[PDB]
Amino acid sequence: PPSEAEEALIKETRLPLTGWQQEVDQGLTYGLEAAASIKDRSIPTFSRGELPHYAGINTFMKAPYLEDVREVGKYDVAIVGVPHDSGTTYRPGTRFGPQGIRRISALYTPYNFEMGVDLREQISLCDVGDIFTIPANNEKSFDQISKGIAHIFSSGAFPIILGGDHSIGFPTVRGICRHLGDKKVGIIHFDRHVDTQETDLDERMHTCPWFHATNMANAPAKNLVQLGIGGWQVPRQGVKVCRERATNILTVTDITEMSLDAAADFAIARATDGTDCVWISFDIDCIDAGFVPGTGWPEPGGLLPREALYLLKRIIRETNVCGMEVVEVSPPYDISDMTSLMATRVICDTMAHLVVSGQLPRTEKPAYIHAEANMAVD
């Protein structure tokens, strides 16, 4: 049987280079041809595109910036930043999450070796910039986030959210549900913390989004799957709510003891039972603190990177995913963007899994996307 590396060499031969050539040609047109001493004539004078990695304006993966967000429906994937840390109960700083993730994402090429995916060749990706968050008023910021996510989601572009603390899980899912009609969404929640209590410090903070998300008809608590719960920061009020609403929880010990495949099976079966799509909400602190120091609620004994990445491989490829957020990256507490890099890897792997499973590019808008907004979902 062939090794993963042998398949990767074969898969790479199947990838085109038209996307790369178009980047080269645009670069030479917009950035001039290189000086006479440069041998490689694909190089421009001015950096325009991927190279050099240390150079250029820092959109996510140096994807095109989409200034006119009304055109977002023309893209397969829209990276959207949510610079929001008004829901943080310990360290703030994740309002800079989007910046840190964009910054370190310059390290990446659009090509994933193991999967034989090249995003520059296989999807159209844009970076729409950031939601205009409201730091002094969590609820107004919620309303901004929901309006923007509902905009991107209803356009048909697949939304990838750069958080931002996890309180945004309520307004993002609320934005989705405004266009779900009567369809239901299962939430697959990677986290050490249940995030299901009603209020915290008298407000709807990052410990609270799934209390309020699953108050919506379109988001059944019975379809909330919570992978990695454990430690000394799981609030007892949230635990009570999980028990009363019958959410589906696995601890890190559960996951490693039952095997990753059985853990993903559990999540796939529970999240899709009676729903039409799945929302992926990935808290970067579900990874062991030694890998993600740049976060508000680090906890030892979390998932190791390859464990979380393998769970995503199983779950993304075998569910109908309608969107994703990666939350709680807090650059001011990071070292050399280690934590932003972990988040970037989750984001890019997810896109690659959507491509491998044929979910992107979409050949038509999904059945669950309703055009008219249901402004009273919450």
**Cβ nearer to Cl ion, comparing 323 with 331:** 331
50 is a site residue for ligand CAC (CB under 6 A)? no
193 is a site residue for ligand CAC (CB under 6 A)? yes
Residues 273-302 that bind ligand CAC (CB under 6 A): 283, 285, 296-297
Residues 194-213 that bind Ni ion (CB under 5 A): 195
| 312, 353 contact by CB (below 8 A) | yes
**Cβ nearer to Ni ion, comparing 57 with 107:** 107
- The three-point CA angle 178-182-185 to 5° equals 70
Among Cl ion, a second copy, ligand CAC, none, residue 8 binds (CB under 5-8 Å by kind): a second copy
- Helix pair 305-317, 338-356: axis angle to 10 deg: 30
Within its chain, how far is the Cα of 292 from the centroid? 16
- Helix pair 138-155, 169-177: axis angle to 10 deg: 40
Q: Which of 23, 191, 307, 325 binds Ni ion (CB under 5 A)?
A: 191
Among Ni ion, ligand CAC, Cl ion, none, residue 207 binds (CB under 5-8 Å by kind): ligand CAC
212 is in an annotated binding site: no
State phi, psi for 287 to the nearest 5 degrees: -75, 145
Q: Following CA atoms 264, 165, 324, 124 in sequence, which dihedral angle do they give, to the nearest 10 degrees?
A: -140
261 is in an annotated binding site: no
User: Judged by CB under 6 A, how many residues of this single chain contact ligand CAC?
Assistant: 12
Residues 146-205 that bind a second copy (CB under 8 A): 146-148, 151, 167, 199, 201-205
193 is in an annotated binding site: yes
283 is in an annotated binding site: yes
Closest CA to 254 of 271, 267, 241, 270: 267
- Helix pair 97-104, 338-356: axis angle to 10 deg: 70
* DSSP classification of residue 158: E
Q: Which of 172, 207, 214, 272 binds ligand CAC (CB under 6 A)?
A: 207
Smallest distance, Ni ion to C-beta of residue 195, A: 5
Among a second copy, ligand CAC, Cl ion, none, residue 166 binds (CB under 5-8 Å by kind): ligand CAC
85 is a site residue for ligand CAC (CB under 6 A)? no
**Helix runs in 273-362, H state only:** 305-317, 338-356
- First-to-final CA distance of the chain: 52
Smallest distance, a second copy to C-beta of residue 145, A: 9
Binding mask 287-306 for Ni ion (x = CB under 5 A): ----------x---------
Q: Which stretch binds ligand CAC (CB under 6 A): 121-129, 150-158, 189-197, 318-326?
A: 189-197
Surface-to-core class of residue 367, CB atoms within 10 Å of its CB (0-12 exposed, 13-18 middle, 19+ buried): exposed
Q: Which residues contact 252 (CB under 8 A, 6 or more apart)?
A: 192, 228, 230, 301, 302, 303
Q: Which amino acid belongs to residue 278?
A: V
Surface-to-core class of residue 212, CB atoms within 10 Å of its CB (0-12 exposed, 13-18 middle, 19+ buried): buried
| Region label for 330, one of left (φ > 0), alpha (ψ between -120 and 50) or beta (otherwise) | beta
**Cβ nearer to a second copy, comparing 42 with 357:** 42
84 is in an annotated binding site: no
81 is a site residue for a second copy (CB under 8 A)? yes
Residues that bind ligand CAC in the complex, under the rule CB under 6 A: 165-166, 191, 193, 195, 206-207, 283, 285, 296-297, 328
Residues that bind Ni ion in the complex, under the rule CB under 5 A: 166, 191, 193, 195, 283, 285, 297
